[PDB]
Design a binder for this molecule. Structure first.
Ligand code: HEM
Length: 322
């Protein structure tokens, strides 16, 4: 019975006999948050949604349904330690975004809001939902802000090892590679299913925490490659963020060997982030964020993983050596 955590591509709209059941269940779940309240409202919504699916082949969520879905999907996230305070989430509605240039501006706003000069705020920007699967909006990055990973002559690493393929992809799309350890990768944005466009992230928007010892690391951990599933609808583009745990800042930029044996702690990080006033999930934050959450008072909705876009993209013509 274990279900796939991945939701792949489509080449045709979701069939009505498949969409309706899901939409109806979401709407129920939505109105269910009001036990005996809004019965006539619930039925009115069902009738409209069904009429919408029958006449247009799909349906649009309301801003409130979307907000509710983004928070439920967060709550339904198995490994997310931040899901305890699922209500502390700012939603940005970018569902009428049309171009990669517009996606770029939305992402800039997201990064700006979320970073908040260090006082990190959790947010999610929801781009248009998948229509026929041939006009998908996708962020080819794994994270909004991530360091480039460069291959060396001896087989070593310069930068983030986990971005080897993606970094290469960037270089192949024209991006000029500086060969440092902390090079912020550009944004590879796909809009309306078109070929991806490369956008440098304004250096100003990147807040970094200083760890020679020789290390830095961005303050904002924002997942950019997941898909939000809600009521049969699919949003292939919905970057979200929280704040670091400190337990993980992947400085796998290493030869950092510089008790038993496996004793490589994560202290300097906890301290470094705190003194530079960048939110990290320490005890005070865990407690405080939970307090804020309490004051506001098949798994679906859900955030799925996807097949890396460069492995599935049917190129048009743009950017050679793709
Ligand atoms: C508020 C701060 C947050 C913290 C400290 C936090 C922490 C975590 C941690 C530790 C993981 C596991 C390791 C990893 O996959 O990187 C994780 C995964 C994840 N988080 Fe968060 N998270 C936060 C906010 C969010 C937000 C705002 C969303 C979405 C709206 C979210 C959605 C997820 C999802 C979908 C995963 C993938 C793994 C899974 O859920 O099973 N997280 N988070």
């Amino acid at each position: 019975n274990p279900k796939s955590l991945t939701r792949g591509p489509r080449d045709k709209p979701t069939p009505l006999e498949e969409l309706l059941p899901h939409a109806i269940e979401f709407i129920n779940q939505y109105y269910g948050s009001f036990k005996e309240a809004k019965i006539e409202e619930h039925l009115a919504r069902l009738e409209a949604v069904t009429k919408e699916i029958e006449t247009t082949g799909t349906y649009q969520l309301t801003l409130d349904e979307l907000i509710f879905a983004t928070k439920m999907a967060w709550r339904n996230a198995p490994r997310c330690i931040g899901r305890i305070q699922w209500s502390n989430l700012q939603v940005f509605d970018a569902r009428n975004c049309s171009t990669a240039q517009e996606m770029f501006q939305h992402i800039c706003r997201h990064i700006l809001y979320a970073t908040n000069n260090g006082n990190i705020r959790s947010a999610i920007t929801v781009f248009p939902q998948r229509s026929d699967g041939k006009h998908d909006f996708r962020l080819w990055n794994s994270q909004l802000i991530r360091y480039a990973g460069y291959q060396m002559p001896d087989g070593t690493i310069r930068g983030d090892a986990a971005t080897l393929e993606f970094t290469q992809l960037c270089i192949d799309l024209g991006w000029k590679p500086r060969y440092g350890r902390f090079d912020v990768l550009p944004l590879v944005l796909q809009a309306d299913g078109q070929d991806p466009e490369v956008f440098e992230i304004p250096p100003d928007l990147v807040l970094e925490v200083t760890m020679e010892l020789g290390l830095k690391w961005y303050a904002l951990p924002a997942v950019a490659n997941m898909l939000l599933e809600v009521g049969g609808l699919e949003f292939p583009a919905c970057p979200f963020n929280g704040w670091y745990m400190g337990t993980e800042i992947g400085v796998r930029d290493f030869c950092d060997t510089q008790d038993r044996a496996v004793t490589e702690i994560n202290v300097a990080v906890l301290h470094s982030f705190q003194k530079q006033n960048v939110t990290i999930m320490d005890h005070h934050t865990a407690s405080e964020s939970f307090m804020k959450h309490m004051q506001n008072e098949v798994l679906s909705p859900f955030y799925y993983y996807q097949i890396e876009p460069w492995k599935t993209h049917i190129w048009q013509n743009e950017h050679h050596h793709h």
